[PDB]
Design a protein around this ligand. Sequence first.
Ligand SMILES: *C/C=C1/C(=C/c2[nH]c(/C=C3[NH+]=C(/C=C4\NC(=O)C(C=C)=C4C)C(C)=C\3CCC(=O)O)c(CCC(=O)O)c2C)NC(=O)[C@H]1C
Ligand SMILES: *C/C=C1/C(=C/c2[nH]c(/C=C3[NH+]=C(/C=C4\NC(=O)C(C=C)=C4C)C(C)=C\3CCC(=O)O)c(CCC(=O)O)c2C)NC(=O)[C@H]1C
Lengths: 313, 315
Amino acid sequence: PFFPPLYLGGPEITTENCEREPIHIPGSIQPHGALLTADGHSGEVLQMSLNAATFLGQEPTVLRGQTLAALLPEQWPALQAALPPGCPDALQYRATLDWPAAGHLSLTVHRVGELLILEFEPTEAPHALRNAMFALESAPNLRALAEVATQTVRELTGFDRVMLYKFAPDATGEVIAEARREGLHAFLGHRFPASDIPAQARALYTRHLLRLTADTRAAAVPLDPVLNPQTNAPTPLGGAVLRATSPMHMQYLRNMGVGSSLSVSVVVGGQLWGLIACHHQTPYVLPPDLRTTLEYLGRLLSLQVQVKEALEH
Amino acid sequence: DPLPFFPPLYLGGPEITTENCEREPIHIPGSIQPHGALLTADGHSGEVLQMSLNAATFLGQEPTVLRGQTLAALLPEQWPALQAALPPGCPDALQYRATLDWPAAGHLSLTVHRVGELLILEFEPTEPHALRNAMFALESAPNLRALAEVATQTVRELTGFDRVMLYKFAPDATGEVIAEARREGLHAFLGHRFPASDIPAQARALYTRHLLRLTADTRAAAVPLDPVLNPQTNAPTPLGGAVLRATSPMHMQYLRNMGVGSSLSVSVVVGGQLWGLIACHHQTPYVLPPDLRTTLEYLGRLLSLQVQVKEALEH
Ligand SMILES: *C/C=C1/C(=C/c2[nH]c(/C=C3[NH+]=C(/C=C4\NC(=O)C(C=C)=C4C)C(C)=C\3CCC(=O)O)c(CCC(=O)O)c2C)NC(=O)[C@H]1C
Ligand SMILES: *C/C=C1/C(=C/c2[nH]c(/C=C3[NH+]=C(/C=C4\NC(=O)C(C=C)=C4C)C(C)=C\3CCC(=O)O)c(CCC(=O)O)c2C)NC(=O)[C@H]1C
């Protein structure tokens, strides 16, 4: 099963109970964005991140009464149609708001049962993706495909290190390709125990395909209330990219000297084949539109891995 | 019966009838569609060899001036990028794309690929979260039918085409329209089947490697390359990888007879075989700009993946 989260007086995580940390329900988010939850029917704002006032520019109480209808007039009917009752928690809808306080915000919404989860992040506003797609497809074998993928991602993102991390049948991981800035350790060829990515994190990574830590020293921002009014239970945040990263894993990143971390799941035959794993030495908020490019690349790599593995077997 | 290609018309080959469909050498028509321009150049020196006859009007230069310069001089910023992206021996399927600001012609999209020692350069005029939203909707579709319906509707919304169909090949290469989105008033093609010769065997092979082709105007005359043969080889210039390549006259007559002014199709490739086609029709001529066509190319790949996934959920 899972332990209760901390804020419901559950045990603190150690290397003895790695498998039982409820990483999906931390009750908090990373501070480079803001999150609201809301009722599926009424559009009634039920929870907000204590930092919402910053991003939205709204007097705190104003929000926690109001309706999405009021708050987001153009958007609220689109949401209603895009995310019908009963849809999967994996389905997401995005829009760009030109919002008074903040030039442009990206809005990302998904639905978990009766709750809409809304994420707001700063945003903005060429051929590198098309060029990359063809490059991946003409790679002659899996090894070269891995090399092209890591190089392409590094060029698109500027990340200090990009790896392709492949899982063995026992969930033992191996760095099979790597693109990195001059003057970093090389993790190419190294293998790592399955417990570094514990079972409950691999399962969530099979369904929700991109996650990140933007700053491995930033404090999480609580949800208020912490419990969902609807249920008097924790809000599931595993489909939210703003979801606070497990401190156990933030500690693992700080000990490596990493300030910023992102990965994309590569999913083949319904199973987690590997990760595009990215490191930055300093804090780094990759903007939403560039993340989208990596999300596309994730799908394309999933296709090409199967194609390429089929021409060996 | 499968038989080798006839020589093209310009090398004294025969004219194509219902009898000899499968032997038309559609990859080497010696000509392009008039809404863009094409140059060929030597892959090592960058000497310009062939150009479409309309090139002066896209590029704003006399032929003899174009042909008298190397790509190093014509494309000083792109020439080194081309050479890195398209190394000798690379496959003909690999494409490099850039946007140019050309004085006379505005923003041009440049698409380049390499066939042996030849570079092929295509120039076309070029111009929010719809793709991301579509990607997730496709993935959440519960079964093959719902996927097919979401895919057709999405493509129609992105493009404004009068008809978008998902055409699926059977094992005998006959095809069936298994989903479609269509303009009000058009008659349904859903559930209809069409014989294997409708898309002959040398088109199907080409459609497994080069995943998008189009006819922007089913009545437009093709524009010859000049000279027609590659001076490197005194042989035909391979245009199978060029979206500008002229469509087979057989296929154009087939489309005009259906009342179609514009056609586009994307290949859906599963396990190395052509599974089906995203096939679009417009009643009037219609040019879809290169950046919009890129969205369809990306959806072609997504759909190939999702078709595998939906079919595996099915035994
Ligand atoms: C007591 C449990 C431990 C633990 C927990 C844990 N680990 C993750 C997720 C990841 N761990 C990763 C490990 C590596 N990163 C590398 O670069 C290498 C090798 C060079 C390894 C072995 C990775 C890549 C992830 C994925 C996330 C990312 O992209 O950074 C989680 C889940 C965190 C979350 O999503 O909130 C958890 C709870 N890790 C341990 O090492 C043990 C001590
Ligand atoms: C004697 C040969 C004939 C022939 C040739 C031919 N066909 C193609 C390619 C295509 N044919 C298509 C036919 C259809 N369009 C539809 O809407 C339906 C069903 C409702 C069918 C059966 C299609 C879709 C294609 C693909 C390209 C496209 O138009 O989007 C070629 C190759 C064309 C080229 O790349 O230059 C050729 C030579 N078709 C016949 O019917 C016989 C008489």
